């Protein structure tokens, strides 16, 4: 009675999640655009009517496959410069004691040793201005890295500005993005369009605080994968921004050493005039609000009677424990205890200000064995930047204790390109069909 | 907006669906990063071929819309074309008969012989 | 063209009963659910109650459970609702609308008010 | 029973100008959304129903669109004749409620 | 070009005619010289301009030869 | 054993090999490692490729077997019909006839366009 026949249709609109390698589209720098394909400047977007899809930002290969081409591009980035394997020699140093603070005493050492020529004969004597993180005492001092790895100078040509990126996926792939807002990064989207490319994304590398990435567009947004274990991190994603001014108002000198034919060596020759430690500016009453807004979302998920404590950092390495980020190509850390201090019970032009440390020997990704040493930098620096986000978590969490303490977080760099990615997905197509028809071939 | 392209009819019923399938045929086709951009264009460019190949052994080379010889079984499918052609969506009817894809595909293949012998018997007269 | 004429509206005491007639033309009577629906004056539009196509399935809202049935006679495509223990709430305009299937742009079928009546006042007064 | 949330409740927009309303319901009703019109006096119309699709007859000026718990109805080129009462129902399950009303006059 | 050929109808034929009439708008010259007073290079520099118009009416008269097909075959 | 499958018709006599074309047909598409697999991959795939290529050019588009309108000539080949399709295999007849293989590929290549150009007149009345 049916007397229905096999019928074959191509193009039919399935999809079946899927990974692959997705490629360039972008617009001297680490972020190489050379090698990326130009954006086109009308990118097209096509709204699916009636779809509802699955989504789930913890288990994206998309941020791995990023993460491994930033690092690959690191690596790429610092092949042809300068090997600093003579700078390995016994140093002689001294306090500076010529117009210093009480906070920047013993901060700074001059030093003085002898180096190597373009000759291989002669040798030459000479100084230079070093930082105490980088120095340790064998008088007699030598860098850390000494004994464990010699790594190279980062050539003084090359910017560490970040350069948005898009990312697209090849052909008979798709890539489906998620217009829902209030989303919180795990569940059914209902609202989706597919997209030919990623929308602009600044590899910022930051650490306890986000720096010049994407705001909420409904309200503050927190995030985690499970709330209930305190071992997940917490994101949270501010509704606005907040206005932070980091400078370094050292005045330095920057002086070439020739340690070889065609080799230089940048060093620091000498401050002019005054001496001060490095500091950033955060708004207080700005802050004040941002926090606010925090705990009253907090308050959704952990109860509406608790109390909510922010306080410093627990321990570990000076890259977990402060916040580490880099200005025109100077490595910053800041010690954020004056902004996560205070206690919330359930019921003018003052600006906080947080010392800063200067870095110059940096190993930026989690490894060993690779370092970087970084040039200075004439003049001194200034910058601005928007704080938008906040990578927290829980203290403790037992049942015993009804008051839930927050503390700051990082270290693992994932989490920032966690952050961008969190409303994107990667499906293969599957034209092929077979269905039912009343035919006879 | 751009509600209709490409998969813009994901989320409409079979009938509707089967009105716009070349927008999705189109587009099938179209120093490190060359790397891996070479090998997405050389993966795609497989499954371009191993789609058009299983095409053309079942005798529907070149058609969208190809009926065959091979019967529907009652036993893969109960639903009837009046709660299928209208009231279902493409991606529905995929999710539920996933299980039974390759026996229908081996039946075209071995069916598409038969009916080059014949022909060909057909001619020798 | 779908005509829907409305009659048996009027002044009522409360507690007391008014039968409302809507008479139908232009269409398959039979194979169309209908609705009654009550305006009052100064709020929105509500759907007071509806009848399938073949009369055996009715529905009503909970403000008017127990009190208002609605009737059709397919014969004469007529549609009828008897009110009893009118209150004052009820004073406004009747409707009688059709509920037409119509086909969205994806390919599905639904049932909305596409043809309404010109309505009928009611007044539940002392 | 599902209750239907219009905003805003009342608006005064001139001519040419784009009127944007906004409905909301407590529940998914797929998009089994319907918007009418009213004039003083007269029966609703029907202009948009599957919150998508355009009735027959109705000026393509008028046009809906949404997903979820929120649907919006879109009027891009005001005219004299487009001015009165608009309502959202929900059709997907007995009771159909209406929405409380977005009155549009002249400004 | 594989793809842009089959998707037309005209799979595996290097002459094949097809259903959309020719509009006297794109050109004017009629067969008299054009196949035996023209070569193939002037007729594309004349023509580059409407190229695209015909491929999608083209596309689009292949598939409603497709569904009548199927009407046919149905009965 | 596994005697039946792929090219275990190797053995088999043509007529009884021509039954079994599409196990043949369907495995012909399918760090430093991973370069000499890209370049195993790409000759395939032209190799595919120009297979197709030649077939389309002859006419027998989509088909496995495909009888054309070019005569056999003597001169290649004396034996008949008797002797050959049940008693030789398709590697003997290939030995044979391997030395006589382009002219006919240039035969068919030729007949073809005249068949395209007759169709082509018939439809212009
Ligand atoms: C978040 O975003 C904000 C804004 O988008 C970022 O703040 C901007 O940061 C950039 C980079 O630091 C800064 O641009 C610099 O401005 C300086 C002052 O105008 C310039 O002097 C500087 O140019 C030097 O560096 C370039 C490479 O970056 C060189 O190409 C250029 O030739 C200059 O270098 C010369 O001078 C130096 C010093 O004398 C010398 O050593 C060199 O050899 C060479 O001779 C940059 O153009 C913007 O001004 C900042 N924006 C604002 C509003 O302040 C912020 O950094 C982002 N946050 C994070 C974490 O990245
Ligand atoms: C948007 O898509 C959804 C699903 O993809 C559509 O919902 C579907 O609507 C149809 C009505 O045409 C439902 O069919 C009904 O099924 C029940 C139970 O089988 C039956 O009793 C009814 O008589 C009717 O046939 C279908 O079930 C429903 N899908 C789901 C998953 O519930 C929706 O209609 C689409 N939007 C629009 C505007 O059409
Ligand atoms: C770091 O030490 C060097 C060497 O001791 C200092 O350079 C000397 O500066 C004095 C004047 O302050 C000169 O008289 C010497 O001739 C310099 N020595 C050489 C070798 O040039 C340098 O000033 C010190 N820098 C700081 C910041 O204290
Ligand atoms: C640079 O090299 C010179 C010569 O090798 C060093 O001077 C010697 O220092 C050692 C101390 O370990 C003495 O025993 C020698 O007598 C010194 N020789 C001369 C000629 O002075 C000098 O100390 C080196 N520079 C630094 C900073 O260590
Ligand atoms: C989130 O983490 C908690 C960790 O406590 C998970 O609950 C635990 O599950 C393990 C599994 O055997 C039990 O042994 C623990 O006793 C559980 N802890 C508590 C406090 O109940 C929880 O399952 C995780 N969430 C999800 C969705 O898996
Ligand atoms: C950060 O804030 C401090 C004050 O808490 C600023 O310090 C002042 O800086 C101005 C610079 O124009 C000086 O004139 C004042 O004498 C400073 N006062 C004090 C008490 O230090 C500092 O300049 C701010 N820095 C930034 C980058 O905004
Ligand atoms: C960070 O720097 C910006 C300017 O680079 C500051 O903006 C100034 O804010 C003051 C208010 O105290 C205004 O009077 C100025 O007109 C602003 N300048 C500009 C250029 O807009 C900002 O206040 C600084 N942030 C903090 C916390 O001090
Ligand atoms: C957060 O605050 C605590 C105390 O308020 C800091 O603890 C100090 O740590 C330094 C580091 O050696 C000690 O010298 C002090 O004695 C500690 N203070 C007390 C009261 O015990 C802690 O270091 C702060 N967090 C960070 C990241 O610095
Ligand atoms: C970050 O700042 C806090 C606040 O100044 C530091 O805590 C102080 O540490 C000093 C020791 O250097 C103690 O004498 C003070 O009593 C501490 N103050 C408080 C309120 O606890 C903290 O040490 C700084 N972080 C680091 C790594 O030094
Ligand atoms: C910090 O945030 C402000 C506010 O979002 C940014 O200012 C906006 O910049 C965008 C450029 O894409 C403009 O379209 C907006 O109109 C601006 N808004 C305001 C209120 O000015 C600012 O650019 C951000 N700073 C950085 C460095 O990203
Ligand atoms: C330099 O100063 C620090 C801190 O005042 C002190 O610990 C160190 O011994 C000093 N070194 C000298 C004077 O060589
Ligand atoms: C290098 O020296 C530091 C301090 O002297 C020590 O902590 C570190 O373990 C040493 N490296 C290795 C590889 O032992
Ligand atoms: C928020 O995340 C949880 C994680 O399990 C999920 O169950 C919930 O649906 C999410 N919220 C929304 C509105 O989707
Ligand atoms: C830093 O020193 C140089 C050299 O004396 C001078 O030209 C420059 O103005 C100084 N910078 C500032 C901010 O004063
Ligand atoms: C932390 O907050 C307390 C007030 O509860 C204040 O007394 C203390 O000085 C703060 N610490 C810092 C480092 O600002």
Redesign the pocket.
């Known amino acids: 009675a049916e007397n229905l026949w096999v019928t074959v249709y191509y193009g039919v609109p399935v999809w079946k999640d899927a990974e692959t390698t997705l490629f360039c589209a972008s617009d001297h720098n680490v972020w190489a655009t050379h090698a990326c394909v130009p954006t086109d400047p009308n990118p097209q977007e096509i709204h699916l009517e009636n779809v509802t899809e699955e989504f789930n930002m913890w288990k994206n290969n998309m941020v791995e496959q990023m993460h491994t081409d930033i690092i690959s591009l690191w690596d790429q980035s610092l092949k042809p410069c300068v090997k600093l394997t003579p700078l390995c020699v016994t140093l002689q140093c001294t306090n500076v004691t010529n117009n210093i603070t009480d906070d920047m005493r013993g901060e700074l050492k001059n030093c003085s040793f002898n180096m190597t020529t373009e000759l291989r004969d002669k040798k030459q004597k000479v100084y230079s201005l070093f930082y105490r993180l980088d120095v340790v005492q064998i008088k007699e001092y030598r860098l850390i890295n000494c004994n464990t790895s010699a790594c190279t100078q980062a050539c003084p040509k090359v910017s560490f500005e970040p350069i948005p990126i898009h990312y697209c996926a090849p052909a008979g792939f798709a890539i489906l993005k998620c217009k829902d807002k209030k989303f919180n990064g795990t569940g059914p989207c209902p609202s989706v369009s597919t997209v030919q490319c990623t929308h602009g994304i600044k590899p910022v590398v930051s650490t306890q605080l986000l720096l010049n990435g994407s705001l909420a567009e409904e309200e503050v947004m927190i995030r985690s994968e499970n709330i209930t274990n305190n071992a997940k991190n917490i994101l949270v994603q501010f509704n606005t921004p907040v206005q932070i001014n980091c400078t370094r108002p050292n005045n330095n000198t920057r002086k070439s050493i020739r340690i070889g034919p065609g080799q230089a060596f940048y060093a620091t020759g000498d401050i002019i005039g005054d001496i001060r430690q490095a500091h950033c500016n955060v708004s207080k009453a700005t802050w004040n609000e941002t926090l606010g807004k925090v705990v009253k979302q907090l308050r959704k998920h952990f109860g509406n009677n608790t109390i909510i404590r922010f306080?410093?950092?627990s321990?570990g390495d000076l890259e977990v424990?402060?916040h580490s980020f880099n200005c025109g190509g100077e490595f910053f850390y800041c010690?954020t205890?004056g902004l996560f201090n205070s206690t919330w019970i359930s019921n003018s032009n003052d600006s906080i200000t947080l010392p800063c440390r200067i870095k110059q020997i940096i190993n930026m990704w989690q490894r060993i064995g690779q370092c970087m040493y970084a040039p200075p930098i004439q003049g001194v620096i200034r910058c601005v930047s928007n704080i938008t986000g906040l990578i927290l978590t829980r203290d403790g969490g037992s049942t015993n204790s009804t008051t839930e303490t927050f503390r700051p977080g990082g270290g693992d760099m994932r989490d920032n390109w966690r952050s961008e990615l969190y409303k994107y997905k990667v499906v293969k197509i599957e034209p092929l069909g077979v269905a039912p028809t009343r035919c006879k071939r | 907006a751009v509600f209709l392209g490409f998969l813009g009819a994901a989320g409409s019923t079979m009938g509707a669906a089967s009105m716009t399938l070349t927008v999705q045929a189109r587009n099938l086709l179209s120093t490190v990063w060359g790397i891996k951009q070479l090998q997405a264009r050389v993966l795609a460019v497989e499954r371009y071929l191993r789609d058009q190949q299983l095409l053309g052994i079942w005798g529907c080379s070149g058609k969208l819309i190809c009926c065959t010889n091979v019967p529907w079984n009652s036993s893969w499918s109960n639903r009837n074309l009046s709660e299928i052609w209208d009231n279902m969506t493409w991606l529905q009817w995929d999710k539920e008969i996933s299980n039974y894809t390759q026996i229908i595909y081996g039946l075209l293949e071995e069916s598409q012989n038969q009916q080059e012998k014949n022909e060909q018997d057909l001619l020798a007269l | 063209e779908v005509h829907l004429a409305e009659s048996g509206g009027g002044l009522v005491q409360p507690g007391g009963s008014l039968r409302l007639s809507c008479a139908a033309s232009g269409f398959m009577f039979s194979a169309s659910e209908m609705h009654w629906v009550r305006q009052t004056p100064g709020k929105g539009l509500e759907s007071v109650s509806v009848i399938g196509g073949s009369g055996t399935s009715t529905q009503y809202v909970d403000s008017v459970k127990g009190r208002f049935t609605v009737s059709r006679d397919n014969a004469k495509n007529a549609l009828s609702l008897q009110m009893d223990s009118l209150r004052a709430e009820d004073t406004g305009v009747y409707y009688c609308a059709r509920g037409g299937e119509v086909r969205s742009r994806g390919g599905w079928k639904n049932r909305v008010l596409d043809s309404w009546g010109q309505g009928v006042q009611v007044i539940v007064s002392p | 029973d599902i209750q239907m949330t219009q905003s805003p409740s009342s608006l005064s927009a001139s001519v040419g100008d784009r009127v944007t309303i906004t409905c909301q319901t407590s529940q998914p009703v797929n998009l089994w959304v319907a918007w009418y019109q009213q004039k003083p006096g007269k029966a609703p119309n029907l202009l948009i129903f599957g919150a998508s699709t355009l009735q027959s007859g109705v000026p393509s000026r008028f046009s809906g669109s949404g997903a979820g718990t929120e649907f919006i109805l879109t009027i891009s080129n005001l005219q004299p004749e487009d001015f009165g009462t608009y309502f959202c129902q929900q059709h997907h399950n007995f009771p159909w409620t209406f929405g409380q009303g977005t009155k549009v006059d002249v400004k």
């Open positions: 306080a410093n950092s321990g424990t402060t010690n205890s």
